[PDB]
């Protein structure tokens, strides 16, 4: 498994930011490094940085990085469901909450592209799609949608659809819900999904239509009408 620093190969460039002005584990480049580690070492099932220093690297990130960096592991552990699913447990009960949100999405993202007769990701993320904290719910729903993109199965879709009318959920949760419903049922034009998401997008007001995440809801409709 390659190292993000080695991909940057800072060991050879003239590090003109160094000495005194490099001794900080600042958020942004740490998030970049976590994403690089996820992308480059994706699907190889192993890492040297976030396996041995799994908890330790997480401890030096902050805020939305936890929801990102932990989920990064899921890309490394792609399609070895029993591989990642044995590795996310140490974070499924993490003291940290944001990294718990990242882990709960990594569980689903590991199952992306594969279908299991057991549907393990469905089982794990079913009880957290209505979690009180927005981050937990967001991670659960994103992971579950990724784990079942293109499945078109109506149990997951009927578990997902009530979140549209769930105005108590923050808007980005509704956006992710529409995105998940769209990718789970792609191009099918199924009325059960389509009418519900149409009514969901029909009710929003001016201050809601202009907000950052509403733009995804039409896509959730459009994904159901691909081609």
Partner 1 sequence: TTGIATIEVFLPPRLKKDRKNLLETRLHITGRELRSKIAETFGLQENYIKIVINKKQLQLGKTLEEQGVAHNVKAMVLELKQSEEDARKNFQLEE
218 binding partner 1? (CB under 8 A):
no
Counting contacts by CB under 8 A, is residue 89 touching partner 1?
yes
Q: Look at the block and give the residue holding tokens 């990724």.
A: 146
Residue 51, interface with partner 1 (CB under 8 A)?
no
Segment lying near partner 1 (by CB under 8 A), choices 33-41, 124-132, 161-169, 192-200:
124-132
What does the alpha-carbon distance between residue 53 and residue 47 come to, in Å, rounded to a whole number? Answer: 10
Residue keyed to tokens 């029993």: 82
Q: Which of 22, 26, 46, 86 is in the footprint of partner 1 by CB under 8 A? A: 86
Tell whether residue 130 is a contact of partner 1 (CB under 8 A).
Answer: no
Task: Return the residue of 48, 90, 115, 168 that touches partner 1, per CB under 8 A.
Answer: 90
Q: Can you read off the two tokens belonging to residue 137?
A: 């719910």
Q: How many helices (H) and strands (E) does the chain have?
A: 15, 0
> Quick one: which of 4, 120, 136 has its CA closest to 67?
136
Spatial neighbors of 15 by CB under 8 A, at least 6 apart, are: 22
Touching partner 1, residues 145-184 (CB under 8 A): 155
Binding site residues, partner 1, CB under 8 A: 55, 82-83, 85-87, 89-96, 116-120, 122-124, 126-127, 155
């Amino acid at each position: 498994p390659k190292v993000p620093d080695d991909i940057y190969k800072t060991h050879l460039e003239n590090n003109r930011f160094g000495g005194s002005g490099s001794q900080v584990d600042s958020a942004r480049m740490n998030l970049a490094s976590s994403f690089v580690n996820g992308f480059v070492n994706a699907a190889f099932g192993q890492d040297k940085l976030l396996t041995d220093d799994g908890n330790k690297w997480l401890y030096k990130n902050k805020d939305h990085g936890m929801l990102s960096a932990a989920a990064s592991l899921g890309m490394i552990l792609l399609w070895d469901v029993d591989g990642g699913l044995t590795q996310i447990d140490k974070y499924l009960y993490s003291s940290e909450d944001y990294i718990k949100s990242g882990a709960l999405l990594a569980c689903g993202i590991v199952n992306s592209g594969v279908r299991n007769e057991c549907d393990p990701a469905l089982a794990l993320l079913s009880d957290y799609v209505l979690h009180n904290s927005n981050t937990m719910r967001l991670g659960s729903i994103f992971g579950l949608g990724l784990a079942y993109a293109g499945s078109n199965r109506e149990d997951v879709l009927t578990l997902l659809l009530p979140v549209m009318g769930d105005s108590k959920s923050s808007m980005e949760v509704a956006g992710v819900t529409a995105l998940a419903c769209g990718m789970i049922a792609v191009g099918s034009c199924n009325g059960d999904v389509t009418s519900t998401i149409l009514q969901t997008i029909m009710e929003k007001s001016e201050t809601e239509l202009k907000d950052t995440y509403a733009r995804w809801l039409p896509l959730g409709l459009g994904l159901n009408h691909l081609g």
